[PDB]
Design a binder for this molecule. Sequence first.
Ligand code: HEM
Length: 381
Amino acid sequence: ACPYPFAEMERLEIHPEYNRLRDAGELGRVLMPYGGETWLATSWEDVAKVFVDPRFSRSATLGKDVPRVLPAIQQPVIMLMDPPEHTRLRRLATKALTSRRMEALRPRTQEVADDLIDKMLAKGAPADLMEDFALPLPIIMICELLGVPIEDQTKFRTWSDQMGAYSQEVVMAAGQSLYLYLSELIAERRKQNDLLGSLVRRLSETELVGFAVTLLIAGYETTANAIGNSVYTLLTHPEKLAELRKDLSLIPKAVDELLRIIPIAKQASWVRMAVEDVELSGTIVKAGEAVAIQTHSANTDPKVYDHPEEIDFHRTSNPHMSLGHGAHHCMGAQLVRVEMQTALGSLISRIPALRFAVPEPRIKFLRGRLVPSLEALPLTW
Ligand code: HEM
């Protein structure tokens, strides 16, 4: 078993191998740094199975020395649950966290988006979209979706930023301040029905605050990167920026085509566990063996997509895996699209003379994460 990761993904590209195996119709076996060897799925068909098939448990690695990447062991989160606990827990949260409820935020997003622009270009010459726009937009929208008082939208932020750049005694101090402030908020909503109110309706207080902290994590630093990384990719392919400044009616299907093509992690997912013998790619991953997935190789499979390694805003359908598949599919999906749609949309519309302030090859990324994130994205206009 050839060791994994294959190469520290510097910048935003992928190691050839993944696509090599997809096409080989080969299921990879790799040696992860911690825990042991794992299997590795790269095909759309075989990444679809691991997302949706019930022969693969996410439960079965809580408290375990499982084929992993970071030494720390994972601490029961929703994304580490199987049916029917997961299903009862998702079934409830879906009744509060609605696709409607999320479309309902588009007018606010416009405000914070279009006034985040106002400020940014109202300041200096060159800017840093990351600190001036890509990072603030999603926390502000997270807050607004929780119905956090705008008088604490900053104090709050400051707490979510110190989850690193902050001392150990003031990491947990932040978390505990966020946990105790987020229960009190749910306490001051039980007497009244928005998202936190709707959540109180069968969920335990423990699961209620749990979820509120999860959404913060699941969709803050991820949504930042999507906005950041997309702008980047769009500026290094203007044939396709231009295609969006001519008509903005495209941006929905664009957001999804940018989601397909940009890698969401620097490497393969947390591993799932086979709870019964399964065939993937002609191999019998036996019960107990572990399988990690690559969404990118699935998101550019020629057996599923035409001209995969090419952008195209007219794709009939777009069954990408950047936002998950089946039971555990991203329950921000709608908010994400909303955020990203209005984020890029105005951004483009407002400032159609946008460009890098530096030679792209010179635009640096970070070494100390699992998701690809720009260290800074300086621009001009
Ligand atoms: C902006 C880019 C985002 C991307 C690319 C993204 C991607 C994903 C992916 C790939 C999963 C797969 C879970 C899995 O099957 O392992 C997922 C799950 C999830 N995401 Fe997101 N997400 C984003 C933003 C958000 C936001 C903004 C929220 C909440 C406000 C959110 C909440 C969740 C939740 C709760 C799950 C777990 C659902 C479950 O386990 O049933 N995400 N997301």
